[PDB]
From Swiss-Prot, chains A, B, C, D, E, F:
The chain holds residues 17 to 48 of 178 of the full protein. Transmembrane segments: none annotated. Synthesized in mammary gland and secreted in milk. Belongs to the calycin superfamily. Lipocalin family. Alternate disulfide bonds occur in equal amounts in all variants examined. Primary component of whey, it binds retinol and is probably involved in the transport of that molecule. It comes from Bos taurus. It is found in: Secreted. This is Beta-lactoglobulin.
Length: 32, 32, 32, 32, 32, 32
Protein backbone atom coordinates (compact mmCIF):
# COMPACT_ATOMS: atom_id res chain seq x y z
CA UNK A 1 0.00 0.00 0.00
CA UNK A 2 1.52 3.27 -1.19
CA UNK A 3 -0.06 6.65 -0.51
CA UNK A 4 1.20 9.95 -1.91
CA UNK A 5 -0.72 13.08 -0.92
CA UNK A 6 0.75 16.45 -1.78
CA UNK A 7 -0.93 19.79 -1.18
CA UNK A 8 0.46 23.06 -2.58
CA UNK A 9 -0.97 26.59 -2.36
CA UNK A 10 -3.88 26.35 0.07
CA UNK A 11 -5.88 29.13 1.75
CA UNK A 12 -7.93 28.17 4.82
CA UNK A 13 -9.60 30.69 7.13
CA UNK A 14 -12.66 30.94 9.38
CA UNK A 15 -12.67 27.24 10.25
CA UNK A 16 -14.50 27.45 13.58
CA UNK A 17 -15.49 23.92 14.51
CA UNK A 18 -13.71 20.56 14.97
CA UNK A 19 -11.06 20.68 12.17
CA UNK A 20 -9.75 17.07 12.34
CA UNK A 21 -6.89 16.96 9.76
CA UNK A 22 -6.53 18.40 6.20
CA UNK A 23 -4.96 15.11 4.97
CA UNK A 24 -4.92 11.63 6.64
CA UNK A 25 -4.10 8.06 5.46
CA UNK A 26 -3.74 4.60 7.12
CA UNK A 27 -4.18 0.82 6.52
CA UNK A 28 -7.69 0.78 8.12
CA UNK A 29 -9.55 4.07 8.96
CA UNK A 30 -13.10 3.91 10.47
CA UNK A 31 -15.31 6.62 12.09
CA UNK A 32 -17.90 5.45 14.68
CA UNK B 1 -2.75 -0.45 -3.96
CA UNK B 2 -1.33 2.89 -5.06
CA UNK B 3 -3.00 6.20 -4.29
CA UNK B 4 -1.85 9.58 -5.59
CA UNK B 5 -3.85 12.62 -4.51
CA UNK B 6 -2.48 16.06 -5.28
CA UNK B 7 -4.25 19.33 -4.58
CA UNK B 8 -2.96 22.68 -5.89
CA UNK B 9 -4.48 26.15 -5.57
CA UNK B 10 -7.38 25.76 -3.14
CA UNK B 11 -9.45 28.44 -1.38
CA UNK B 12 -11.47 27.33 1.67
CA UNK B 13 -13.21 29.74 4.05
CA UNK B 14 -16.27 29.84 6.32
CA UNK B 15 -16.17 26.11 7.08
CA UNK B 16 -17.99 26.17 10.42
CA UNK B 17 -18.87 22.60 11.25
CA UNK B 18 -17.00 19.28 11.61
CA UNK B 19 -14.37 19.55 8.80
CA UNK B 20 -12.95 15.98 8.88
CA UNK B 21 -10.09 16.02 6.29
CA UNK B 22 -9.79 17.57 2.77
CA UNK B 23 -8.13 14.36 1.44
CA UNK B 24 -7.98 10.84 3.01
CA UNK B 25 -7.06 7.33 1.73
CA UNK B 26 -6.60 3.84 3.29
CA UNK B 27 -6.93 0.06 2.59
CA UNK B 28 -10.44 -0.12 4.19
CA UNK B 29 -12.39 3.08 5.13
CA UNK B 30 -15.93 2.78 6.64
CA UNK B 31 -18.21 5.39 8.34
CA UNK B 32 -20.76 4.06 10.90
CA UNK C 1 2.75 0.53 3.87
CA UNK C 2 4.38 3.72 2.60
CA UNK C 3 2.90 7.17 3.18
CA UNK C 4 4.27 10.39 1.70
CA UNK C 5 2.45 13.60 2.60
CA UNK C 6 4.04 16.90 1.66
CA UNK C 7 2.47 20.31 2.17
CA UNK C 8 3.96 23.49 0.69
CA UNK C 9 2.66 27.07 0.81
CA UNK C 10 -0.27 26.99 3.24
CA UNK C 11 -2.18 29.88 4.83
CA UNK C 12 -4.28 29.06 7.92
CA UNK C 13 -5.87 31.70 10.15
CA UNK C 14 -8.93 32.11 12.38
CA UNK C 15 -9.06 28.43 13.35
CA UNK C 16 -10.89 28.79 16.67
CA UNK C 17 -12.00 25.32 17.68
CA UNK C 18 -10.34 21.92 18.23
CA UNK C 19 -7.68 21.88 15.44
CA UNK C 20 -6.48 18.23 15.72
CA UNK C 21 -3.61 17.96 13.16
CA UNK C 22 -3.20 19.29 9.56
CA UNK C 23 -1.73 15.92 8.41
CA UNK C 24 -1.81 12.49 10.18
CA UNK C 25 -1.10 8.86 9.10
CA UNK C 26 -0.86 5.44 10.84
CA UNK C 27 -1.42 1.66 10.35
CA UNK C 28 -4.94 1.78 11.93
CA UNK C 29 -6.69 5.14 12.68
CA UNK C 30 -10.25 5.14 14.17
CA UNK C 31 -12.37 7.97 15.72
CA UNK C 32 -15.02 6.95 18.33
CA UNK D 1 5.81 21.18 -10.12
CA UNK D 2 4.76 17.91 -8.50
CA UNK D 3 6.04 14.53 -9.64
CA UNK D 4 4.83 11.18 -8.31
CA UNK D 5 6.46 8.07 -9.76
CA UNK D 6 5.74 4.73 -8.13
CA UNK D 7 6.98 1.37 -9.38
CA UNK D 8 5.74 -1.93 -7.93
CA UNK D 9 6.57 -5.50 -8.96
CA UNK D 10 9.40 -5.18 -11.48
CA UNK D 11 11.68 -7.87 -12.94
CA UNK D 12 14.91 -6.70 -14.58
CA UNK D 13 17.72 -9.03 -15.65
CA UNK D 14 20.45 -9.23 -18.29
CA UNK D 15 20.90 -5.46 -18.51
CA UNK D 16 24.48 -5.39 -19.78
CA UNK D 17 25.17 -1.86 -20.94
CA UNK D 18 24.96 1.65 -19.44
CA UNK D 19 21.80 1.38 -17.24
CA UNK D 20 21.36 5.08 -16.26
CA UNK D 21 18.36 5.08 -13.84
CA UNK D 22 14.97 3.25 -13.90
CA UNK D 23 13.14 6.47 -12.85
CA UNK D 24 14.39 10.12 -12.87
CA UNK D 25 12.71 13.57 -12.58
CA UNK D 26 13.89 17.22 -12.29
CA UNK D 27 12.97 20.86 -13.16
CA UNK D 28 15.10 20.83 -16.38
CA UNK D 29 16.59 17.55 -17.78
CA UNK D 30 18.62 17.63 -21.06
CA UNK D 31 20.86 14.98 -22.73
CA UNK D 32 23.70 16.27 -25.00
CA UNK E 1 9.19 21.19 -6.74
CA UNK E 2 8.04 18.01 -5.03
CA UNK E 3 9.23 14.56 -6.07
CA UNK E 4 7.92 11.28 -4.65
CA UNK E 5 9.46 8.09 -6.01
CA UNK E 6 8.65 4.82 -4.29
CA UNK E 7 9.79 1.40 -5.44
CA UNK E 8 8.46 -1.83 -3.90
CA UNK E 9 9.18 -5.45 -4.83
CA UNK E 10 12.03 -5.28 -7.35
CA UNK E 11 14.23 -8.08 -8.72
CA UNK E 12 17.50 -7.04 -10.39
CA UNK E 13 20.24 -9.49 -11.38
CA UNK E 14 22.97 -9.84 -14.01
CA UNK E 15 23.53 -6.09 -14.34
CA UNK E 16 27.11 -6.16 -15.60
CA UNK E 17 27.90 -2.68 -16.85
CA UNK E 18 27.79 0.88 -15.45
CA UNK E 19 24.62 0.76 -13.26
CA UNK E 20 24.29 4.49 -12.38
CA UNK E 21 21.28 4.65 -9.97
CA UNK E 22 17.84 2.91 -9.99
CA UNK E 23 16.10 6.21 -9.03
CA UNK E 24 17.45 9.82 -9.16
CA UNK E 25 15.87 13.33 -8.96
CA UNK E 26 17.16 16.95 -8.78
CA UNK E 27 16.34 20.59 -9.75
CA UNK E 28 18.48 20.41 -12.97
CA UNK E 29 19.87 17.05 -14.26
CA UNK E 30 21.91 16.97 -17.54
CA UNK E 31 24.08 14.21 -19.13
CA UNK E 32 26.96 15.36 -21.43
CA UNK F 1 12.64 21.23 -3.39
CA UNK F 2 11.39 18.13 -1.60
CA UNK F 3 12.47 14.62 -2.55
CA UNK F 4 11.05 11.43 -1.05
CA UNK F 5 12.49 8.14 -2.31
CA UNK F 6 11.56 4.95 -0.51
CA UNK F 7 12.59 1.47 -1.57
CA UNK F 8 11.15 -1.67 0.06
CA UNK F 9 11.76 -5.34 -0.78
CA UNK F 10 14.62 -5.33 -3.29
CA UNK F 11 16.73 -8.23 -4.58
CA UNK F 12 20.04 -7.35 -6.26
CA UNK F 13 22.70 -9.90 -7.18
CA UNK F 14 25.43 -10.41 -9.79
CA UNK F 15 26.11 -6.69 -10.21
CA UNK F 16 29.70 -6.91 -11.45
CA UNK F 17 30.60 -3.50 -12.79
CA UNK F 18 30.60 0.10 -11.49
CA UNK F 19 27.42 0.14 -9.31
CA UNK F 20 27.21 3.90 -8.53
CA UNK F 21 24.20 4.22 -6.14
CA UNK F 22 20.70 2.60 -6.12
CA UNK F 23 19.07 5.97 -5.26
CA UNK F 24 20.54 9.54 -5.47
CA UNK F 25 19.08 13.10 -5.37
CA UNK F 26 20.48 16.68 -5.28
CA UNK F 27 19.79 20.31 -6.35
CA UNK F 28 21.92 19.98 -9.55
CA UNK F 29 23.21 16.54 -10.75
CA UNK F 30 25.26 16.31 -14.02
CA UNK F 31 27.34 13.44 -15.53
CA UNK F 32 30.26 14.43 -17.85
Amino acid sequence: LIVTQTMKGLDIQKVAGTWYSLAMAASDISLL
